[PDB]
Amino acid sequence: DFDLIIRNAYLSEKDSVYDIGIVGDRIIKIEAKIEGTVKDEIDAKGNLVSPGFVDAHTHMDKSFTSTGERLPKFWSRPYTRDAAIEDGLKYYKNATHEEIKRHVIEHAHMQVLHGTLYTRTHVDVDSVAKTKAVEAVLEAKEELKDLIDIQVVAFAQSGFFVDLESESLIRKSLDMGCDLVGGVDPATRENNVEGSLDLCFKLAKEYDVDIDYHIHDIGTVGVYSINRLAQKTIENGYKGRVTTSHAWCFADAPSEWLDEAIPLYKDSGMKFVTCFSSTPPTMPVIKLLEAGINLGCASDDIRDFWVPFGNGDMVQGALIETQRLELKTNRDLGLIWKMITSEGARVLGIEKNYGIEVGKKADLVVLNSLSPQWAIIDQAKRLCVIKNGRIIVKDEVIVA
Amino acid sequence: DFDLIIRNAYLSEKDSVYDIGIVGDRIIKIEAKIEGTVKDEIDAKGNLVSPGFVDAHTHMDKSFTSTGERLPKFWSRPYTRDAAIEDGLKYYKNATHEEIKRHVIEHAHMQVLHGTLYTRTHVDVDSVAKTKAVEAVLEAKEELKDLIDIQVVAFAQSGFFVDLESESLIRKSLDMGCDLVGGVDPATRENNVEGSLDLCFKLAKEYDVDIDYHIHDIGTVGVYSINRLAQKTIENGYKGRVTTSHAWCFADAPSEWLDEAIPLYKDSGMKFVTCFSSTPPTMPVIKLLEAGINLGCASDDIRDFWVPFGNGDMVQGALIETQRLELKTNRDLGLIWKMITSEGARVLGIEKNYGIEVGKKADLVVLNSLSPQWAIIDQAKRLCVIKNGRIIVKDEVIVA
Ligand SMILES: [Cl-]
Ligand SMILES: [Cl-]
Ligand SMILES: [Zn+2]
Ligand SMILES: [Zn+2]
């Protein structure tokens, strides 16, 4: 019979309560009542059971570097991208393989305590970090495979045309086994939009990897950089293989620029990720989703020299998004929930095995709340977390 | 001898770790090490101990009315003030004294679990509620005297010049013992700014009570309404006795209007409350505080037909404000912390007995975090809550 049954699980997509039967790492049966009994059971008690949350953009390598003292380190100054880059170069100067590795494990545990079972982390690759951070992350990734699936982005944080050693280092990193490649700000960092982008596509083709680009530039220069990225996506036959992270520019650029760009994004299969530690309040999130653009959600940095905040909790991030974007209706909170779940899945390219349906992966979160909406509102802690059909978290403890 | 000693308490205002000695409801000794006998002790273990949080604007009477189903009630339609007023009139048509009372105690317990020991609630007074809600709240207030101090605003939710029965009903309500009086939107609700305000000042003088006004109107009409309120504050000799809640208008009105109004606000001793369930993202919070304007913070409604959110947790609210306003520096998170503490106290008029100083009330919160900043960031649960020198909360349960 079953390896695991979840009793009395409210499923949002079906709007009813079901027993869930699991064998190995797969969901086999979803029924109003499953008969009769097996060794491992979890009673969800009428509360929501959800697939694992998806944190589509993190920086596990540099997380928790702000911790250590009474006040967060690094935060006696305001945030600016270039200064945050410089703090990274100091930090990476003499950080050891093991300090990074432990940060990554710490990060993952926190995430998984909150029911995130899938994440895509960017890792700094530049002339100071070299491939040291890539090494530590790949190593930790391997150790964490029973807790959390990780996609790794070889991330040229300093700029391909600013730090001229980046190209060969990204090349090593991808050969070490990073799963995607990405740059930062073609325009205001690189000062070369065509060049930075072409180089990124070249590297992606050499190693047959997907792309995740950090585009922070605000306004029309940001929309323009994404437009170029999207057009080159088509030219290079990379439809559906490119993610644009942040895209804060959609918030202040004229709405017309977005209206005109949307068919291009749909035609290029452009994917986006908005991080709840920075989503602009006038970000047209709802509009993007209603237009059928694939928009995921994410923590971004956690407790470092870019972002002091962070608990790796996508349910807390959903609440933050509702506040940033002033959402209140059940429909809208419902859309945000999709963003931390199935939209993130699609961004990650795992949609086929993702969801609470027969045949899907037994990667689940049993919550202490009645519905997506109530979970966002009441912020109750996770009751149970299940990965590969095995219970890995039970009542605030990693039991794996 | 002490009735209570808190060991190893990090105090933000002193930036060091101290023992806190308490007798009855008072702090009597603060010292690096307190030798002496003692009945009860709490070890804060190097973590931050803070005074009780101040939730300067709530609506305890209608709270939790959204609860009951799988999805929040009322949230199949978006929010507009007038529609919310209409849901209240339906709700209040059939609500019983006991229902309201229970909502108020639930609300208070929740607040207190999170270390709020002081709150100002508004209570709907209009031709449907009549004084029923005032009755339930005053009764509950009495029962809750050992957990939380409550100020009650007789609040003319429907408008003095719209619901004509409001004036006599507010009179009764103040005679029943409400501590302040308040209206809503002189301009777009009442359609009479001079009249609505003069009437309010009239009722305040008859019963010698302070004023708390809901001003939601956006833009210049909002600034104008507050300017008239502030000028009439001076004319009526009510300096320091008037609070403006919300003032969303400061966010979209031209910055010049605020610049010119600031001396008037200082001159009138105008107090403000921003609620974290609605603070506009471009609200000039930092600017107000730097100018020495007294700005408190608050939950506003909790789980009702105005706001579906709510946990009565001012530490969670502080995180939300950092996100709404995009704050990250230690200095700014510090200012937000003042807003949920000492600024709220000053809005309430209790600043003299408020704080962790010798002679002050023994109303305290022992946290599981190192500092104001880390508390906002890590959102750790409260370790211990102390009111009137007695432990009322210990490990997520009310032990009073
Ligand atoms: Cl170019
Ligand atoms: Cl008028
Ligand atoms: Zn990033
Ligand atoms: Zn209000």
mmCIF file of C-alpha atoms in Angstrom, chain A residues 101-360:
data_model
loop_
_atom_site.group_PDB
_atom_site.id
_atom_site.type_symbol
_atom_site.label_atom_id
_atom_site.label_comp_id
_atom_site.label_asym_id
_atom_site.label_seq_id
_atom_site.Cartn_x
_atom_site.Cartn_y
_atom_site.Cartn_z
ATOM 1 C CA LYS A 101 29.251 26.569 2.117
ATOM 2 C CA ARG A 102 27.819 27.004 5.646
ATOM 3 C CA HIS A 103 25.943 30.136 4.538
ATOM 4 C CA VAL A 104 24.416 28.193 1.726
ATOM 5 C CA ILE A 105 23.274 25.364 4.015
ATOM 6 C CA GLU A 106 21.914 27.860 6.547
ATOM 7 C CA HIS A 107 19.950 29.549 3.766
ATOM 8 C CA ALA A 108 18.552 26.281 2.523
ATOM 9 C CA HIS A 109 17.454 25.121 5.953
ATOM 10 C CA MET A 110 15.622 28.355 6.545
ATOM 11 C CA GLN A 111 13.874 28.109 3.212
ATOM 12 C CA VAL A 112 12.883 24.552 3.744
ATOM 13 C CA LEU A 113 11.594 25.271 7.301
ATOM 14 C CA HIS A 114 9.115 27.590 5.528
ATOM 15 C CA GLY A 115 8.133 25.115 2.822
ATOM 16 C CA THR A 116 10.306 26.261 -0.095
ATOM 17 C CA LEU A 117 11.492 23.115 -1.906
ATOM 18 C CA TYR A 118 12.731 24.746 -5.121
ATOM 19 C CA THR A 119 15.065 27.698 -5.597
ATOM 20 C CA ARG A 120 17.363 29.306 -8.190
ATOM 21 C CA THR A 121 20.414 30.907 -6.759
ATOM 22 C CA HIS A 122 22.800 33.278 -8.433
ATOM 23 C CA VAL A 123 26.461 33.047 -7.440
ATOM 24 C CA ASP A 124 29.020 35.811 -7.833
ATOM 25 C CA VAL A 125 31.588 35.097 -10.529
ATOM 26 C CA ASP A 126 34.189 37.818 -10.909
ATOM 27 C CA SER A 127 37.962 38.385 -10.614
ATOM 28 C CA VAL A 128 37.912 38.292 -6.778
ATOM 29 C CA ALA A 129 35.430 35.489 -6.083
ATOM 30 C CA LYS A 130 36.759 33.630 -9.120
ATOM 31 C CA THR A 131 35.036 30.199 -9.000
ATOM 32 C CA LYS A 132 35.403 29.885 -5.262
ATOM 33 C CA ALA A 133 31.789 30.690 -4.497
ATOM 34 C CA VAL A 134 30.642 28.431 -7.398
ATOM 35 C CA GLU A 135 32.625 25.611 -5.863
ATOM 36 C CA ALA A 136 31.113 26.001 -2.391
ATOM 37 C CA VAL A 137 27.598 26.239 -3.753
ATOM 38 C CA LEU A 138 27.825 23.176 -6.047
ATOM 39 C CA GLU A 139 29.232 21.222 -3.156
ATOM 40 C CA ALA A 140 26.460 22.282 -0.811
ATOM 41 C CA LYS A 141 23.874 21.731 -3.485
ATOM 42 C CA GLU A 142 24.921 18.086 -3.558
ATOM 43 C CA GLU A 143 24.545 17.734 0.247
ATOM 44 C CA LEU A 144 21.125 19.377 0.170
ATOM 45 C CA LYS A 145 19.563 17.226 -2.539
ATOM 46 C CA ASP A 146 17.200 15.446 -0.080
ATOM 47 C CA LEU A 147 15.906 18.859 1.177
ATOM 48 C CA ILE A 148 15.691 21.278 -1.739
ATOM 49 C CA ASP A 149 16.215 21.356 -5.507
ATOM 50 C CA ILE A 150 18.650 24.148 -6.520
ATOM 51 C CA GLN A 151 19.314 25.713 -9.938
ATOM 52 C CA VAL A 152 22.600 27.701 -10.033
ATOM 53 C CA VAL A 153 23.233 30.774 -12.130
ATOM 54 C CA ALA A 154 26.816 31.631 -12.954
ATOM 55 C CA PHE A 155 26.341 35.319 -12.361
ATOM 56 C CA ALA A 156 28.686 37.914 -13.672
ATOM 57 C CA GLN A 157 28.011 40.374 -10.899
ATOM 58 C CA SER A 158 30.652 42.982 -11.806
ATOM 59 C CA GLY A 159 29.937 43.156 -15.541
ATOM 60 C CA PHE A 160 31.508 41.335 -18.508
ATOM 61 C CA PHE A 161 32.853 44.654 -19.972
ATOM 62 C CA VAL A 162 33.915 46.051 -16.579
ATOM 63 C CA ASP A 163 35.751 43.077 -15.102
ATOM 64 C CA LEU A 164 37.430 41.676 -18.217
ATOM 65 C CA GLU A 165 38.298 38.436 -16.422
ATOM 66 C CA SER A 166 34.594 37.486 -16.161
ATOM 67 C CA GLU A 167 34.210 35.731 -19.500
ATOM 68 C CA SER A 168 36.716 32.982 -18.829
ATOM 69 C CA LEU A 169 35.492 32.624 -15.234
ATOM 70 C CA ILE A 170 31.854 32.200 -16.314
ATOM 71 C CA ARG A 171 33.208 29.634 -18.748
ATOM 72 C CA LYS A 172 34.835 27.625 -16.031
ATOM 73 C CA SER A 173 31.816 27.895 -13.800
ATOM 74 C CA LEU A 174 29.472 26.606 -16.423
ATOM 75 C CA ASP A 175 31.877 23.754 -17.026
ATOM 76 C CA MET A 176 31.914 23.106 -13.302
ATOM 77 C CA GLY A 177 28.136 22.607 -13.662
ATOM 78 C CA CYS A 178 26.142 25.822 -13.170
ATOM 79 C CA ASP A 179 22.700 25.384 -14.846
ATOM 80 C CA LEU A 180 22.142 28.984 -16.136
ATOM 81 C CA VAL A 181 24.146 32.035 -17.039
ATOM 82 C CA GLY A 182 23.405 35.682 -16.257
ATOM 83 C CA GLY A 183 24.644 39.200 -16.309
ATOM 84 C CA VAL A 184 23.783 42.586 -14.785
ATOM 85 C CA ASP A 185 22.591 45.856 -16.413
ATOM 86 C CA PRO A 186 23.744 45.990 -20.020
ATOM 87 C CA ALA A 187 23.232 49.711 -20.002
ATOM 88 C CA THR A 188 24.277 51.456 -16.814
ATOM 89 C CA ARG A 189 26.771 48.878 -15.519
ATOM 90 C CA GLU A 190 28.356 47.460 -18.740
ATOM 91 C CA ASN A 191 27.879 50.469 -20.909
ATOM 92 C CA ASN A 192 27.306 48.059 -23.775
ATOM 93 C CA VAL A 193 23.884 46.597 -24.357
ATOM 94 C CA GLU A 194 24.398 44.785 -27.645
ATOM 95 C CA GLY A 195 27.799 43.576 -26.566
ATOM 96 C CA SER A 196 26.983 42.391 -23.101
ATOM 97 C CA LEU A 197 23.884 40.560 -24.319
ATOM 98 C CA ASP A 198 25.535 38.911 -27.355
ATOM 99 C CA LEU A 199 28.336 37.630 -25.157
ATOM 100 C CA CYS A 200 25.828 36.175 -22.699
ATOM 101 C CA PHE A 201 23.969 34.371 -25.506
ATOM 102 C CA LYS A 202 27.248 33.013 -26.873
ATOM 103 C CA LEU A 203 28.177 31.522 -23.501
ATOM 104 C CA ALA A 204 24.661 30.106 -23.108
ATOM 105 C CA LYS A 205 24.923 28.349 -26.485
ATOM 106 C CA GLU A 206 28.412 26.928 -25.890
ATOM 107 C CA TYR A 207 27.153 25.083 -22.808
ATOM 108 C CA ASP A 208 23.496 24.686 -23.714
ATOM 109 C CA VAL A 209 22.224 26.552 -20.579
ATOM 110 C CA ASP A 210 19.344 28.889 -19.902
ATOM 111 C CA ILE A 211 19.719 32.583 -19.088
ATOM 112 C CA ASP A 212 18.775 34.645 -16.012
ATOM 113 C CA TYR A 213 19.596 38.410 -16.339
ATOM 114 C CA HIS A 214 19.590 40.955 -13.523
ATOM 115 C CA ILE A 215 17.953 44.092 -15.012
ATOM 116 C CA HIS A 216 17.588 46.769 -12.342
ATOM 117 C CA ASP A 217 17.880 49.880 -14.618
ATOM 118 C CA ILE A 218 14.843 52.001 -14.125
ATOM 119 C CA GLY A 219 12.684 53.643 -16.708
ATOM 120 C CA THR A 220 12.929 53.440 -20.492
ATOM 121 C CA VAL A 221 16.590 52.347 -20.446
ATOM 122 C CA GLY A 222 15.426 49.312 -18.475
ATOM 123 C CA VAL A 223 12.541 48.548 -20.841
ATOM 124 C CA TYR A 224 14.837 49.015 -23.769
ATOM 125 C CA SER A 225 17.461 46.591 -22.318
ATOM 126 C CA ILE A 226 14.753 43.936 -21.852
ATOM 127 C CA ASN A 227 13.435 44.558 -25.298
ATOM 128 C CA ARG A 228 16.868 43.947 -26.742
ATOM 129 C CA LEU A 229 17.224 40.861 -24.590
ATOM 130 C CA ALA A 230 13.826 39.585 -25.814
ATOM 131 C CA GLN A 231 14.554 40.246 -29.459
ATOM 132 C CA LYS A 232 17.929 38.448 -29.188
ATOM 133 C CA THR A 233 16.114 35.619 -27.443
ATOM 134 C CA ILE A 234 14.149 35.089 -30.656
ATOM 135 C CA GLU A 235 17.168 35.617 -32.949
ATOM 136 C CA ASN A 236 19.161 33.004 -31.085
ATOM 137 C CA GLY A 237 16.313 30.446 -30.972
ATOM 138 C CA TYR A 238 16.056 30.692 -27.130
ATOM 139 C CA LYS A 239 12.307 31.132 -26.772
ATOM 140 C CA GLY A 240 11.299 30.093 -23.257
ATOM 141 C CA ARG A 241 14.988 29.806 -22.038
ATOM 142 C CA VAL A 242 15.447 33.351 -20.732
ATOM 143 C CA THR A 243 14.407 34.931 -17.427
ATOM 144 C CA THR A 244 14.525 38.640 -16.620
ATOM 145 C CA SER A 245 14.989 39.277 -12.930
ATOM 146 C CA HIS A 246 13.585 42.399 -11.301
ATOM 147 C CA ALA A 247 12.526 44.578 -14.155
ATOM 148 C CA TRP A 248 11.841 47.470 -11.829
ATOM 149 C CA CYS A 249 11.687 49.554 -14.976
ATOM 150 C CA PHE A 250 8.129 48.372 -15.662
ATOM 151 C CA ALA A 251 7.054 50.444 -12.680
ATOM 152 C CA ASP A 252 8.258 53.895 -13.781
ATOM 153 C CA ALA A 253 8.521 53.574 -17.603
ATOM 154 C CA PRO A 254 5.475 54.858 -19.446
ATOM 155 C CA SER A 255 2.707 52.297 -19.441
ATOM 156 C CA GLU A 256 2.687 52.510 -23.258
ATOM 157 C CA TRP A 257 6.191 51.036 -23.407
ATOM 158 C CA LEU A 258 4.969 48.034 -21.532
ATOM 159 C CA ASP A 259 1.805 47.769 -23.666
ATOM 160 C CA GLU A 260 3.920 47.710 -26.837
ATOM 161 C CA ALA A 261 6.512 45.336 -25.386
ATOM 162 C CA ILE A 262 4.067 42.726 -24.120
ATOM 163 C CA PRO A 263 3.533 40.947 -27.504
ATOM 164 C CA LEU A 264 7.287 40.722 -27.917
ATOM 165 C CA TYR A 265 7.634 39.160 -24.451
ATOM 166 C CA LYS A 266 4.914 36.650 -25.192
ATOM 167 C CA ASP A 267 6.399 35.818 -28.570
ATOM 168 C CA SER A 268 9.911 35.343 -27.005
ATOM 169 C CA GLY A 269 8.488 33.334 -24.090
ATOM 170 C CA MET A 270 10.119 35.804 -21.696
ATOM 171 C CA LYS A 271 9.930 34.858 -18.072
ATOM 172 C CA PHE A 272 10.167 37.286 -15.143
ATOM 173 C CA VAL A 273 10.931 37.232 -11.488
ATOM 174 C CA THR A 274 9.999 39.927 -9.043
ATOM 175 C CA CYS A 275 11.593 39.818 -5.655
ATOM 176 C CA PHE A 276 9.504 40.842 -2.671
ATOM 177 C CA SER A 277 12.431 42.589 -1.087
ATOM 178 C CA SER A 278 12.320 45.142 -3.895
ATOM 179 C CA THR A 279 9.117 44.930 -6.060
ATOM 180 C CA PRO A 280 8.210 48.527 -6.765
ATOM 181 C CA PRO A 281 4.798 49.505 -5.407
ATOM 182 C CA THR A 282 3.590 50.625 -8.898
ATOM 183 C CA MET A 283 4.881 47.463 -10.492
ATOM 184 C CA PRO A 284 2.144 46.268 -12.879
ATOM 185 C CA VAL A 285 2.163 42.735 -11.429
ATOM 186 C CA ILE A 286 -1.546 42.094 -11.855
ATOM 187 C CA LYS A 287 -1.427 43.429 -15.384
ATOM 188 C CA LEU A 288 1.453 41.167 -16.347
ATOM 189 C CA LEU A 289 -0.354 38.087 -14.968
ATOM 190 C CA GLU A 290 -3.633 39.031 -16.674
ATOM 191 C CA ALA A 291 -1.758 39.303 -19.933
ATOM 192 C CA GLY A 292 -0.445 35.788 -19.346
ATOM 193 C CA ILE A 293 3.128 36.751 -18.733
ATOM 194 C CA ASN A 294 4.930 34.318 -16.550
ATOM 195 C CA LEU A 295 5.864 36.148 -13.382
ATOM 196 C CA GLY A 296 7.560 34.376 -10.451
ATOM 197 C CA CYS A 297 8.412 35.664 -6.999
ATOM 198 C CA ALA A 298 11.492 35.540 -4.808
ATOM 199 C CA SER A 299 13.397 36.577 -1.651
ATOM 200 C CA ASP A 300 16.441 37.995 -3.458
ATOM 201 C CA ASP A 301 19.293 38.478 -1.012
ATOM 202 C CA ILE A 302 18.976 37.503 2.605
ATOM 203 C CA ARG A 303 20.747 39.407 5.353
ATOM 204 C CA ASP A 304 23.677 40.732 3.429
ATOM 205 C CA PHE A 305 25.258 43.901 1.956
ATOM 206 C CA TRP A 306 22.485 44.271 -0.655
ATOM 207 C CA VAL A 307 19.453 43.496 1.561
ATOM 208 C CA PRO A 308 19.345 43.405 5.334
ATOM 209 C CA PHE A 309 15.967 41.678 5.459
ATOM 210 C CA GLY A 310 15.184 38.021 4.999
ATOM 211 C CA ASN A 311 13.562 34.929 6.407
ATOM 212 C CA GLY A 312 13.385 32.750 3.296
ATOM 213 C CA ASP A 313 9.658 32.501 3.775
ATOM 214 C CA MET A 314 7.598 32.902 0.616
ATOM 215 C CA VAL A 315 4.348 33.117 2.594
ATOM 216 C CA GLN A 316 5.761 36.141 4.438
ATOM 217 C CA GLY A 317 6.932 37.460 1.060
ATOM 218 C CA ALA A 318 3.382 37.067 -0.309
ATOM 219 C CA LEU A 319 2.100 39.218 2.498
ATOM 220 C CA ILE A 320 4.810 41.794 1.761
ATOM 221 C CA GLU A 321 3.763 41.846 -1.958
ATOM 222 C CA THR A 322 0.103 42.472 -1.022
ATOM 223 C CA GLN A 323 1.251 45.467 0.956
ATOM 224 C CA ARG A 324 3.737 46.790 -1.633
ATOM 225 C CA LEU A 325 1.105 46.534 -4.323
ATOM 226 C CA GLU A 326 -1.949 47.373 -2.084
ATOM 227 C CA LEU A 327 -3.907 44.223 -2.828
ATOM 228 C CA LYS A 328 -6.835 43.011 -0.795
ATOM 229 C CA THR A 329 -9.347 41.047 -2.834
ATOM 230 C CA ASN A 330 -9.364 37.257 -2.673
ATOM 231 C CA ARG A 331 -8.695 37.097 -6.361
ATOM 232 C CA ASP A 332 -5.524 39.185 -6.051
ATOM 233 C CA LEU A 333 -4.186 37.294 -3.032
ATOM 234 C CA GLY A 334 -4.940 34.214 -5.134
ATOM 235 C CA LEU A 335 -2.760 35.549 -7.905
ATOM 236 C CA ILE A 336 0.107 36.230 -5.491
ATOM 237 C CA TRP A 337 -0.190 32.684 -4.202
ATOM 238 C CA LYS A 338 0.210 31.390 -7.761
ATOM 239 C CA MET A 339 3.317 33.496 -8.012
ATOM 240 C CA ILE A 340 4.974 31.786 -5.074
ATOM 241 C CA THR A 341 3.932 28.381 -6.436
ATOM 242 C CA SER A 342 2.998 27.468 -10.021
ATOM 243 C CA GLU A 343 4.388 30.645 -11.672
ATOM 244 C CA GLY A 344 7.729 30.004 -10.005
ATOM 245 C CA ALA A 345 7.556 26.450 -11.196
ATOM 246 C CA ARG A 346 7.107 27.600 -14.785
ATOM 247 C CA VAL A 347 10.027 30.010 -14.401
ATOM 248 C CA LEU A 348 12.123 27.107 -13.183
ATOM 249 C CA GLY A 349 10.918 24.910 -16.084
ATOM 250 C CA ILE A 350 9.473 22.187 -13.737
ATOM 251 C CA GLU A 351 5.749 22.730 -14.314
ATOM 252 C CA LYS A 352 5.152 19.192 -15.606
ATOM 253 C CA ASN A 353 6.094 17.532 -12.320
ATOM 254 C CA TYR A 354 4.772 20.416 -10.159
ATOM 255 C CA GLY A 355 1.371 20.535 -8.419
ATOM 256 C CA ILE A 356 -0.935 18.398 -6.240
ATOM 257 C CA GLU A 357 -2.170 16.060 -8.954
ATOM 258 C CA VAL A 358 -1.934 12.334 -9.489
ATOM 259 C CA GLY A 359 1.492 11.532 -11.009
ATOM 260 C CA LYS A 360 3.223 14.639 -9.660
#
